[PDB]
Curated annotation (Swiss-Prot):
It comes from the Eukaryota. Phosphorylated by CDK1; regulates dissociation from intermediate filaments during mitosis. Signal peptide: none annotated. It comes from Homo sapiens. It is found in: Cytoplasm, Cytoskeleton; Cell junction, Hemidesmosome; Cell projection, Podosome. The gene is PLEC. The chain holds residues 175 to 400 of 4684 of the full protein. This is Plectin. It is linked to Epidermolysis bullosa simplex 5C, with pyloric atresia: A form of epidermolysis bullosa, a genodermatosis characterized by recurrent blistering, fragility of the skin and mucosal epithelia, and erosions caused by minor mechanical trauma. EBS5C is an autosomal recessive disorder characterized by severe skin blistering at birth and congenital pyloric atresia. Death usually occurs in infancy. Epidermolysis bullosa simplex 5B, with muscular dystrophy: A form of epidermolysis bullosa, a genodermatosis characterized by recurrent blistering, fragility of the skin and mucosal epithelia, and erosions caused by minor mechanical trauma. EBS5B is an autosomal recessive disorder characterized by progressive muscular dystrophy associated with generalized skin blistering. Residues 5-108, 121-226 form the Calponin-homology (CH) domain.
């Protein structure tokens, strides 16, 4: 299924947003994590820690590098779903996506605290609550999920407007198309808020936008807004 296509593109861009600070770069997500070197570098950039590396070109050496990465994560109470080193060394599409998601969850999404919070809300729920609160003042805007609610680009625009009203023309948003609104919000957010583009407008303007892809981008909106 091709929500996986969008998810792969989103995860590839998220990884690269950080890997570039280590002069590294991923083209094919399903190939370029297999020898463990980019994962280790990613974990170092994200955490600041120094990790070991195994030198070599054999699979024997590759499995060892991947285990460096997974153990680093496991040792930090990060639960890894049926993911063994050789799934990654073999470029298993589903498990590779699942590993990156786990990393995005741990370093970016997990520590959130929102006003109005309930006692045992997951990270997902708190982020949803935060989005609802940001647009509570706006007539004709509502947020019920991390899929359908975000398709036409108006939540993305309102959220920016709520924090920096000078940046966004809300009346113009209500005349514009989905693609023009999406494109404007992502551009304003990048140029003025320092938020890297993880999503392309045509990845969002679909019957059902990928939930993990939207959460990743909305998460980085929350993280970057003062």
């Amino acid at each position: 299924d091709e929500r996986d296509r969008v998810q792969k593109k989103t995860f590839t861009k998220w990884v690269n947003k950080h890997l570039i600070k280590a002069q590294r770069h991923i083209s094919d997500l399903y190939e370029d994590l297999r020898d463990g070197h980019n994962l280790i570098s990613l974990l170092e950039v994200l955490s600041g820690d120094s990790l070991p590396r195994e030198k070599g070109r054999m699979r024997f050496h590759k499995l060892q590098n991947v285990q460096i990465a997974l153990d680093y994560l496991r040792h930090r109470q990060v639960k890894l779903v049926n993911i063994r080193n050789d799934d990654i060394a073999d470029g298993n599409p589903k498990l590779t996506l699942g590993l990156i998601w786990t990393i995005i969850l741990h370093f970016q999404i997990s520590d959130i605290q929102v006003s109005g919070q309930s006692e045992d809300m997951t990270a997902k729920e708190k982020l949803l609550l935060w989005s609802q609160r940001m647009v509570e003042g706006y007539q004709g805007l509502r947020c019920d999920n991390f899929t359908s609610s975000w398709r036409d680009g108006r939540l993305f625009n309102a959220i920016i407007h709520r924090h920096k009203p000078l940046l966004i023309d809300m009346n113009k948003v209500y005349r514009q198309t989905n693609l023009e609104n999406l494109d404007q919000a992502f551009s304003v957010a990048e140029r003025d808020l320092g938020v890297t583009r993880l999503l392309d407008p045509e990845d969002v303007d679909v019957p059902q936008p990928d939930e993990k892809s939207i959460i990743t981008y909305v998460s980085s909106l929350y993280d970057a807004m003062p």
